[PDB]
Amino acid sequence: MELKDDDFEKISELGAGNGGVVFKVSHKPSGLVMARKLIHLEIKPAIRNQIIRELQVLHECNSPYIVGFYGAFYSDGEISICMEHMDGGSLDQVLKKAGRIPEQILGKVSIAVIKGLTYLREKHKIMHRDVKPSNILVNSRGEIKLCDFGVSGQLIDSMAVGTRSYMSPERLQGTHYSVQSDIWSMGLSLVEMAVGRYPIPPPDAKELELMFPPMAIFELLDYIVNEPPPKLPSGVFSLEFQDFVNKCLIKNPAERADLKQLMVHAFIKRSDAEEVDFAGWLCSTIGLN
Numbered sequence: 001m002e003l004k005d006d007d008f009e010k011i012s013e014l015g016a017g018n019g020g021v022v023f024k025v026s027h028k029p030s031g032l033v034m035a036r037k038l039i040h041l042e043i044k045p046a047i048r049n050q051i052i053r054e055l056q057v058l059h060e061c062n063s064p065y066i067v068g069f070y071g072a073f074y075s076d077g078e079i080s081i082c083m084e085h086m087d088g089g090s091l092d093q094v095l096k097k098a099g100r101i102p103e104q105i106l107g108k109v110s111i112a113v114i115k116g117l118t119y120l121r122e123k124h125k126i127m128h129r130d131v132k133p134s135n136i137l138v139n140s141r142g143e144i145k146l147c148d149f150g151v152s153g154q155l156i157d158s159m160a161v162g163t164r165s166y167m168s169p170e171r172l173q174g175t176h177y178s179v180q181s182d183i184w185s186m187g188l189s190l191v192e193m194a195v196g197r198y199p200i201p202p203p204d205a206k207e208l209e210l211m212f213p214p215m216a217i218f219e220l221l222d223y224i225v226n227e228p229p230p231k232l233p234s235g236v237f238s239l240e241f242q243d244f245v246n247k248c249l250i251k252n253p254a255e256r257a258d259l260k261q262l263m264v265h266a267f268i269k270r271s272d273a274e275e276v277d278f279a280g281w282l283c284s285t286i287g288l289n
């Protein structure tokens with residue numbers, strides 16, 4: 001069935017970010033609860049049809065590790081993307097409530113991200129372009145899924161920041177980037193979620209004892225490109241996890257691990273095996289089920 005603006009009704013607001021908002025909505029004809037992302041684009045009527053045409057590939061993006069698509073359309077100023085509502089929210093929200101995410105749980109997340117990126121690359125020849133805790137969504141059935149990935153080339157162009165960057169040194173320095181950049185972002189997201197705050201600048205010894213002003217824009221970006229990369233602190237995390245993120249966070253993109261290598265890394269092989277009630281933990285920590 002085709003989706004159209006007058007067929008919806010706002011239930012609540014799921015949040016916002018550097019531009020458009022997302023509503024939890026009810027599609028009246030179907031009865032389905034959905035997440036409707038609205039993106040404001042003062043943009044000519046020709047190229048906004050291309051965007052919709054290009055977003056139709058999302059109907060073929062079916063994976064347990066990728067947020068489901070219902071449809072896309074242009075309303076009155078705004079292009080609407082309608083997706084699966086994920087009742088656990090994004091990992092940036094669960095981090096706020098959780099304080100930290102345990103390593104075992106990050107093992108399950110790492111698995112999901114790797115397998116999602118792999119799906120998008122192998123089956124659709126696309127890079128994410130925007131991996132970070134807020135674009136990894138989770139639900140009470142224990143699923144972990146990626147969203148907000150770069151399907152439509154046009155949409156990427158029509159949007160082209162914030163105060164915290166998950167961009168890789170190479171992408172920060174110019175156009176010379178591609179799929180290896182998603183690895184960096186994943187690695188940084190993981191350190192963030194393990195430690196409970198954005199890992200740049202790194203915490204001093206005294207701030208690490210406590211766990212176990214904000215930087216200016218240029219200061220921070222300079223740190224990412226010119227200063228050694230962030231590390232998981234020693235002692236409180238397994239050596240294999242430490243290696244995992246170190247392999248993700250190698251400044252040189254060719255030297256950096258790729259998805260094939262990460263898939264067979266000791267930390268994944270260990271997390272594959274482990275028995276973890278992610279569904280249970282998630283609800284327990286945010287108060288749902």
Ligand SMILES: Nc1ncnc2c1ncn2[C@@H]1O[C@H](COP(=O)(O)OP(=O)(O)OP(=O)(O)O)[C@@H](O)[C@H]1O
Nearest residue numbers: 014015016017018020022035084085086089090134
């Ligand atoms: N499908 C969904 N189900 C449930 N919540 C969602 C869904 N999509 C987005 N959200 C929520 O909406 C919020 C805003 O999302 P949006 O993608 O507009 O920005 P963001 O990714 O949070 O931050 P940024 O602006 O840096 O991308 C997210 O933080 C997330 O909590």
Ligand SMILES: O=C(NOC[C@H](O)CO)c1oc2ccncc2c1Nc1ccc(I)cc1F
Nearest residue numbers: 017018019020067081148149150151152155156
């Ligand atoms: O939402 C995106 N960025 O977040 C920016 C924030 O809202 C800030 O304003 C975004 O960027 C793209 C670029 C190209 N193609 C698609 C998208 C796309 N959305 C998208 C992709 C897959 C699925 I499942 C659902 C989606 F909502």
Ligand SMILES: [Mg+2]
Nearest residue numbers: 017134135148
């Ligand atoms: Mg987002």
